[PDB]
Amino acid sequence: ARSRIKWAIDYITKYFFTEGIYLQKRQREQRLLESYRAEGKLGEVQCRLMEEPPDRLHVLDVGSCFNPFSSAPHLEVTALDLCPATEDVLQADFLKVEVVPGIREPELEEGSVRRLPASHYECVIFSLLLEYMPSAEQRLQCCLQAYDLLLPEGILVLITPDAHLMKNWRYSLARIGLLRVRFEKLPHISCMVFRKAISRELSQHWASIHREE
Numbered sequence: 483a484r485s486r487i488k489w490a491i492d493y494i495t496k497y498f499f500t501e502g503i504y505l506q507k508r509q510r511e512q513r514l515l516e517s518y519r520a521e522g523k524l525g526e527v528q529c530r531l532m533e534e535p536p537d538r539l540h541v542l543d544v545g546s547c548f549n550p551f552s553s554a555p556h557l558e559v560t561a562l563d564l565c566p567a568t569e570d571v572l573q574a575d576f577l578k579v580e581v582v583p584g585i586r587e588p589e590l591e592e593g594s595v596r597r598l599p600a601s602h603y604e605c606v607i608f609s610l611l612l613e614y615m616p617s618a619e620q621r622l623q624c625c626l627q628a629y630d631l632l633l634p635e636g637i638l639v640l641i642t643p644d645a646h647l648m649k650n651w652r653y654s655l656a657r658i659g660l661l662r663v664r665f666e667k668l669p670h671i672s673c674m675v676f677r678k679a680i681s682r683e684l685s686q687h688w689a690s691i692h693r694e695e
């Protein structure tokens with residue numbers, strides 16, 4: 483009876499606060515960048531790193547039917563949904579949202595969220611959302627927008643319903659800068675976390691050497 487909501491809250495706390503996983507992965511990715519540089523495959527790459535996590539994490543719950551994460555301690559949740567079921571969830575079609583730099587809060591037009599702050603959220607949650615998307619092109623679009631919304635070393639929680647697909651998702655997301663850091667099987671669901679690596683070039687290379695036709 484493990485809830486995807488309880489699993490997600492548990493990981494986020496471990497990642498930023500109680501186990502400092504973000505520092506463990508930083509060191510792992512720094513070691514990987516040195517291994518690639520030592521093979522002549524990569525040279526000078528831009529690396530952007532997070533400061534010490536705040537006491538209140540900025541979380542974006544996309545496809546948030548009812549804002550399950552709003553009550554969690556130390557999570558400032560901004561909730562979005564195409565068909566909100568509760569009054570605390572904002573109306574929006576994520577596929578049409580602009581990721582804007584230079585803004586602090588969502589900007590609404592006609593009651594629908596149309597602009598969100600870039601590199602502002604420590605976490606973005608896609609809990610059983612991507613399968614509602616029609617095409618694969620639009621699923622990837624959701625993750626590309628999440629990467630622009632995340633801060634350096636922020637995380638994308640991806641929960642999907644229930645092989646070679648999960649390794650193709652790892653490849654396709656590593657190609658946009660998101661490396662998988664956790665995979666767990668809960669009843670009828672598969673819970674994964676993807677991290678905005680210190681360098682996109684780094685993740686793009688890991689993907690190139692892990693593509694299997």
Ligand SMILES: Nc1ncnc2c1ncn2[C@@H]1O[C@H](C[C@@H](N)CC[C@H](N)C(=O)O)[C@@H](O)[C@H]1O
Nearest residue numbers: 545546547563564565574575576609610611614
């Ligand atoms: N293009 C879209 N833009 C915004 N929200 C969407 C879009 N397509 C589906 N949704 C919402 O994503 C939600 C999918 C739900 N199954 C997930 C609800 C909740 N996140 C959960 O973990 O159960 C629905 O409430 C949809 O309204």
